[PDB]
Amino acid sequence: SSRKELANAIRALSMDAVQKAKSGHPGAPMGMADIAEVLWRDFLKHNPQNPSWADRDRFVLSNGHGSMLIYSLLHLTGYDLPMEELKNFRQLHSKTPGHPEVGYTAGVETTTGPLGQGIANAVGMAIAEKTLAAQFNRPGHDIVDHYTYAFMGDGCMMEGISHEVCSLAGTLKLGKLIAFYDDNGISIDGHVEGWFTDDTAMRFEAYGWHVIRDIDGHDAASIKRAVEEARAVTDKPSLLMCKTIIGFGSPNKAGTHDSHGAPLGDAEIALTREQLGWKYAPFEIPSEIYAQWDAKEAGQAKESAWNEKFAAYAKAYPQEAAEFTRRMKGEMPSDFDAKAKEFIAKLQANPAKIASRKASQNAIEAFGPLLPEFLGGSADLAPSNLTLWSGSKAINEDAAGNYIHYGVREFGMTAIANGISLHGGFLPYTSTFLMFVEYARNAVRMAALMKQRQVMVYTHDSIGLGEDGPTHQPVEQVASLRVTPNMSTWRPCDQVESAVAWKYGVERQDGPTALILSRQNLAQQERTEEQLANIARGGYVLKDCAGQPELIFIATGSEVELAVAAYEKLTAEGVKARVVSMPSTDAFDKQDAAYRESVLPKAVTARVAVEAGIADYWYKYVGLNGAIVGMTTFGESAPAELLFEEFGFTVDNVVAKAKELLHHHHH
Amino acid sequence: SSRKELANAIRALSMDAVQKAKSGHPGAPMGMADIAEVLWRDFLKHNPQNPSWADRDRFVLSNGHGSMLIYSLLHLTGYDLPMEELKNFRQLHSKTPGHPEVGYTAGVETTTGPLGQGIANAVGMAIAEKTLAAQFNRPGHDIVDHYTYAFMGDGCMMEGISHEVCSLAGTLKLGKLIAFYDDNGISIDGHVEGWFTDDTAMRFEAYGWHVIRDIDGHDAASIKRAVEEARAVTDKPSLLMCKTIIGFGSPNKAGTHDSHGAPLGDAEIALTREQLGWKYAPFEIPSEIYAQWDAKEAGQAKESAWNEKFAAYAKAYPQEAAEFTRRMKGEMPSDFDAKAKEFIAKLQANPAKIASRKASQNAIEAFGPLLPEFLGGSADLAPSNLTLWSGSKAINEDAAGNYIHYGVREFGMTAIANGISLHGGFLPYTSTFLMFVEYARNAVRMAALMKQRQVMVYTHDSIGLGEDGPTHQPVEQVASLRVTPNMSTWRPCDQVESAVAWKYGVERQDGPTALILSRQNLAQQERTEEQLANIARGGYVLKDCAGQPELIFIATGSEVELAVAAYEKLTAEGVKARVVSMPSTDAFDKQDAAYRESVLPKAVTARVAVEAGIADYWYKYVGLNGAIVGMTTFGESAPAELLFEEFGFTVDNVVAKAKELLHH
Ligand SMILES: COc1ncc(C[n+]2csc(CCOP(=O)(O)OP(=O)(O)O)c2C)c(N)n1
Ligand SMILES: COc1ncc(C[n+]2csc(CCOP(=O)(O)OP(=O)(O)O)c2C)c(N)n1
Numbered sequence A: 001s002s003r004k005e006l007a008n009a010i011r012a013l014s015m016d017a018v019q020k021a022k023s024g025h026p027g028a029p030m031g032m033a034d035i036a037e038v039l040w041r042d043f044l045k046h047n048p049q050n051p052s053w054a055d056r057d058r059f060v061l062s063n064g065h066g067s068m069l070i071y072s073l074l075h076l077t078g079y080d081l082p083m084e085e086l087k088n089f090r091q092l093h094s095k096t097p098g099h100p101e102v103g104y105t106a107g108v109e110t111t112t113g114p115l116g117q118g119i120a121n122a123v124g125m126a127i128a129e130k131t132l133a134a135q136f137n138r139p140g141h142d143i144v145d146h147y148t149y150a151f152m153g154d155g156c157m158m159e160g161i162s163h164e165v166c167s168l169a170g171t172l173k174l175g176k177l178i179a180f181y182d183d184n185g186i187s188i189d190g191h192v193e194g195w196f197t198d199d200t201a202m203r204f205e206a207y208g209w210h211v212i213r214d215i216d217g218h219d220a221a222s223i224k225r226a227v228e229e230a231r232a233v234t235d236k237p238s239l240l241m242c243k244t245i246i247g248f249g250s251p252n253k254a255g256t257h258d259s260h261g262a263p264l265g266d267a268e269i270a271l272t273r274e275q276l277g278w279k280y281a282p283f284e285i286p287s288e289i290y291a292q293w294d295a296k297e298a299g300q301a302k303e304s305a306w307n308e309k310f311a312a313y314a315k316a317y318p319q320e321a322a323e324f325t326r327r328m329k330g331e332m333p334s335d336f337d338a339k340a341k342e343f344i345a346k347l348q349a350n351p352a353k354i355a356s357r358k359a360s361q362n363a364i365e366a367f368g369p370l371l372p373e374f375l376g377g378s379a380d381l382a383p384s385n386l387t388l389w390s391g392s393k394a395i396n397e398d399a400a401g402n403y404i405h406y407g408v409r410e411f412g413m414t415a416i417a418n419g420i421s422l423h424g425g426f427l428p429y430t431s432t433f434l435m436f437v438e439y440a441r442n443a444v445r446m447a448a449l450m451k452q453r454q455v456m457v458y459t460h461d462s463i464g465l466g467e468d469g470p471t472h473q474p475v476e477q478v479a480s481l482r483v484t485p486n487m488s489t490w491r492p493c494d495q496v497e498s499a500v501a502w503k504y505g506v507e508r509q510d511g512p513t514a515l516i517l518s519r520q521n522l523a524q525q526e527r528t529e530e531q532l533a534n535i536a537r538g539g540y541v542l543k544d545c546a547g548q549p550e551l552i553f554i555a556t557g558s559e560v561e562l563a564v565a566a567y568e569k570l571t572a573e574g575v576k577a578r579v580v581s582m583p584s585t586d587a588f589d590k591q592d593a594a595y596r597e598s599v600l601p602k603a604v605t606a607r608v609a610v611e612a613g614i615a616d617y618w619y620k621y622v623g624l625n626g627a628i629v630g631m632t633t634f635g636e637s638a639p640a641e642l643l644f645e646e647f648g649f650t651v652d653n654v655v656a657k658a659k660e661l662l663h664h665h666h667h
Numbered sequence B: 001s002s003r004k005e006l007a008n009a010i011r012a013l014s015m016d017a018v019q020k021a022k023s024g025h026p027g028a029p030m031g032m033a034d035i036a037e038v039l040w041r042d043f044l045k046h047n048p049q050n051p052s053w054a055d056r057d058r059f060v061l062s063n064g065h066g067s068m069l070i071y072s073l074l075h076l077t078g079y080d081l082p083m084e085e086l087k088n089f090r091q092l093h094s095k096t097p098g099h100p101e102v103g104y105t106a107g108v109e110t111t112t113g114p115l116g117q118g119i120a121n122a123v124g125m126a127i128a129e130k131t132l133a134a135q136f137n138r139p140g141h142d143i144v145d146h147y148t149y150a151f152m153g154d155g156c157m158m159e160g161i162s163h164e165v166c167s168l169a170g171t172l173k174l175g176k177l178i179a180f181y182d183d184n185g186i187s188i189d190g191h192v193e194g195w196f197t198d199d200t201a202m203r204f205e206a207y208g209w210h211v212i213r214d215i216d217g218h219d220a221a222s223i224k225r226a227v228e229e230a231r232a233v234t235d236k237p238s239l240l241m242c243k244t245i246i247g248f249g250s251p252n253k254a255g256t257h258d259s260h261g262a263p264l265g266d267a268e269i270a271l272t273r274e275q276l277g278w279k280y281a282p283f284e285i286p287s288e289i290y291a292q293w294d295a296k297e298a299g300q301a302k303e304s305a306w307n308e309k310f311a312a313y314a315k316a317y318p319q320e321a322a323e324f325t326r327r328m329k330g331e332m333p334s335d336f337d338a339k340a341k342e343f344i345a346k347l348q349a350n351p352a353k354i355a356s357r358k359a360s361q362n363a364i365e366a367f368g369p370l371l372p373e374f375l376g377g378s379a380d381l382a383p384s385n386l387t388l389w390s391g392s393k394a395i396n397e398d399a400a401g402n403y404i405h406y407g408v409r410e411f412g413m414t415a416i417a418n419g420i421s422l423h424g425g426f427l428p429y430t431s432t433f434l435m436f437v438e439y440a441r442n443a444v445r446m447a448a449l450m451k452q453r454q455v456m457v458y459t460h461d462s463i464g465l466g467e468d469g470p471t472h473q474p475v476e477q478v479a480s481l482r483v484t485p486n487m488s489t490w491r492p493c494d495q496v497e498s499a500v501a502w503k504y505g506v507e508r509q510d511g512p513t514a515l516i517l518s519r520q521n522l523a524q525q526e527r528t529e530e531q532l533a534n535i536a537r538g539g540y541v542l543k544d545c546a547g548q549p550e551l552i553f554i555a556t557g558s559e560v561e562l563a564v565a566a567y568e569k570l571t572a573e574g575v576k577a578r579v580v581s582m583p584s585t586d587a588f589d590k591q592d593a594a595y596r597e598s599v600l601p602k603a604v605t606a607r608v609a610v611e612a613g614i615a616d617y618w619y620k621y622v623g624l625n626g627a628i629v630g631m632t633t634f635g636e637s638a639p640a641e642l643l644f645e646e647f648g649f650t651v652d653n654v655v656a657k658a659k660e661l662l663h664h
């Protein structure tokens, strides 16, 4: 078959699968099919029989609405994605969801769709390859050597996150990152010139990319040459400007917004088959076309050759090879649990009244020698977020390092880190002031959706940061994280809870962990052995009374010290009180009903929550017959100690609110 | 005094005010002082005696951590910002908060600090000026003619939002937008080359900006020539690449990250006074220096001349002048309330089962002729969000129009709209799929913090959108909006609630309103006159029983019809059931306690919330002894009907959860 005929198999499967679903996006798959045919058949290094091969090239579809493009490619090249799944595009529990999802589908590297995040993930995958190669390759033994290819469209280009990640990719000289821009002139509102007029090539050359202009994206020879030229440029990421016709093949919808995001229609599909010369019925592919598309034999040969390389590496570098395997599998060192528990126990025995940001740095320092897989960073806040430890080495200084200066790029940082976690080999941590989780908010959500391990270090968590004022002082951000499916959020009250939360985060394989950390010093609380072990249960009894309490304080973070002081005052007056420390609501909620009842007994309705954050969250635990000492407004610019007083975070106010609550219960 | 001495007054006030507060950012004020002296003394058109003058130039400090720069300028030029306020920098309830805040301080145009948002706001102010000029200017009567000047640093340049807004500013040919880049080589982590290497000038030329490279930001002559060149370019926005030394004047901390964000220290301040030749004590400014900085005389002359121009315009164009004044004041048309109520009543009397996104479009259509101040748009989703009405005119086609194709730029769109609302003259609306509020999330927060009127049209609100799947299907986004201070959030259940929510949004005077709108068709509910009037109270009794209820359903949006169906089944069994429609929790919470008790009586604890969004929000209204039929997970890619079944939004499940609750 000709290359065009082979590309037309993608066009047919895509338009037909969209038509059967009565839903989806035929335009981009049809527009990019010729580019995909060249990339996948002539360049991509992959094995359909082992999508987890450590040294495979990575492909990312940033314009993820064009999901039938990737499903067509995976099916045609021989991945475990049968035709029946393509017939079930966009149907419940299929392996072909409307936007591609990692883990749903053999060979899908990342979950994309939200525009711009795929190219960010690709930048992270390329950072991961470069860093892993620098750490592990040895003379005569280049066990890490693979490309990262991304497809992206006008939407990804317009999004700010593309500026963040492509600027940084230029700084880091990511020569194995090769992106293809689907330059088709169309977006949902119509012809893009009304709203998008950049000289995109000039923009990317400003970032330090190698840019190939004016590629005919429907001419295989032109595409091939461009890819060869990009793979030969080793010191700059490459952008291939591919002029395409959206909906290529459709006489009436090609080149129109109408092809973007709805089925073409049966009549138009018939005309499209006639224009393309594609005779096969829907979901029909002849054996000769499979024979030309299939990648099993070549992929086997390539992976077998790599396995020989790796065996030779392991003979020469046995400990390094064992580390490579461990890290690519995402496994933890066998002695990490015991060492981390020893550190936590030492902290409990050796109080220190320090900020939880500093307790976080101390945990990084303790873990760093044990976790060479860390690839950490901050969005231009290293000296404030406290993300450097003595063993940190920035990768812009030495490519075998373990630290990234992300710059002022919170969203890009977080989505890059998603790419790092998806690549394998690393455990990323990212950091900014908590407020600016709002800049990165959907990338945080994507980490949770993709079930990725990433520790998110968010410092300066409340009005306790003081004078920078309400644009910086979080109020409602923690509550937003707490209600995010599969998110873990920890607001430790002292250096011990901080170390427990760090341990929890690095050991959490199936989703991310946000640490909510103070600027100001936090008192260490006394704990028995059981209480120390109970921190990891998310909520636990810290102070108690004999018999059923008539009042339970529930507090987090910096406010535990205040709640304990109120408990002491009330206890001295004969009130039966309890304090619950709730460092993680999500972990608490995952405990069984008996444990949760033991901490928050249903008989006790006089519950007082204390937290320098939005009050409305806490109805979940205090109900309608309690009290909340929380924030209900934005903050103010002033010294923190004056803010806590003004907003009611004082022993006198907490005691008064508790006594008022009890008075109402009594009368 | 020399121009350097005049600039050094900013340096002294800034370093001394930071020192006294023991907090703040001396570096950028010291680095930018010479640029500020030229801009403010030689070019800026403003009146300290009236910071609200409609035709003033707008200045925006996007690198807002350098707040003492603006406080120094406002004090020195004669605004109502006395020295004792500068001595109270960063102190409780002062007029000099650590990042500048609109409304706190005479002459501050916007609240900045979160990096990149100031330049976005400036783009919006420049769009507003261009559009208002096109709408109102007439031959011989150019009543709108002013510049928008912005300062910005490396942080703003690195942020993605700068790409969004500066790309769009290039498309829109905003020749009166002039930005100054503080190119000082330093950020918090140190020397920026380790993480920021763009050819920024080339980048901005790629956006279609006029760029002036290599300006000596410590040389008044160089700065002045560059500003003159930029003003003379009328068909593109300009970027001035100003090479500065952060902390200029400090022997030991100039050019260092140390000068960014902490007091210099007393010894270093003394050395800085020596290096600068600045002889005056902290908070001492000699009369000569005030005389050269003061803008009161010139500013009043310029504003009076404008007033006389406006008076002549009003004689020639009386109706247009009255509209200009009304719109610049942010007032609503006197008959808007009555006309909007008439529209709402018509909808209630003429039921339609349509998506609330369509009901939103229909409200825009009804309001459009009444609200010429609308300046609306969508982030490349006009045909899906349904933001166009018959009278929409895109400003890229007709500069006197009322609609912006924002492109795929959600954060930039929202922060541009903040600039539009801050400018005066317009009522912006913005739109995207609800999920992608997360891309714009801090700009939404900033609208609320700044008490700005903006209607945020968020469609495709739940698993009801169907096959696009979990990356698109909102779950927890509404709950986050609901707990944001000063946000209003409406999730209307039908076309009538949708119109009421739109009316509420446009009538806010002091904050934004998010509309949470469905992809799919919503049945219209029947209402008495009292119920119709009570939609605007945010929560109301939609279906009731005789006597005290035994069971109360609380539902929103697309789930009201489901709650009603469960109510009908339980009512037929003989349960004393009620349905409360809760389109806006914030409007409900602001009602008097008797009204709230009439809807959600405190004695009735058997409450079942029903909403295709995160369950955890609803404990606020159901407490510990109720039930919630909500989401607890991400969505899935499938047809909407099947998803509602998969996730428990069925009559059987709602009834079962209510019966379980009643059985205790
Ligand atoms: C903020 O995140 C975000 N917002 C909106 C959408 C929906 N959407 C898909 S595509 C496109 C605009 C056009 O994107 P573009 O690649 O040019 O399209 P095609 O040419 O058809 O491939 C838009 C607007 C999305 N998926 N993610
Ligand atoms: C995402 O929003 C955001 N994130 C962080 C900060 C804190 N911060 C202020 S400045 C700067 C980096 C350097 O910003 P830059 O203008 O170069 O500084 P100077 O040269 O001292 O003026 C940083 C990192 C902020 N205000 N807003």
Ligand SMILES: [Ca+2]
Pocket (backbone or CB within 6 Å): A153, A154, A155, A182, A184, A185, A186, A187
């Ligand atoms: Ca396109």
Ligand SMILES: [Ca+2]
Pocket (backbone or CB within 6 Å): B153, B154, B155, B182, B184, B185, B186, B187
């Ligand atoms: Ca800087």
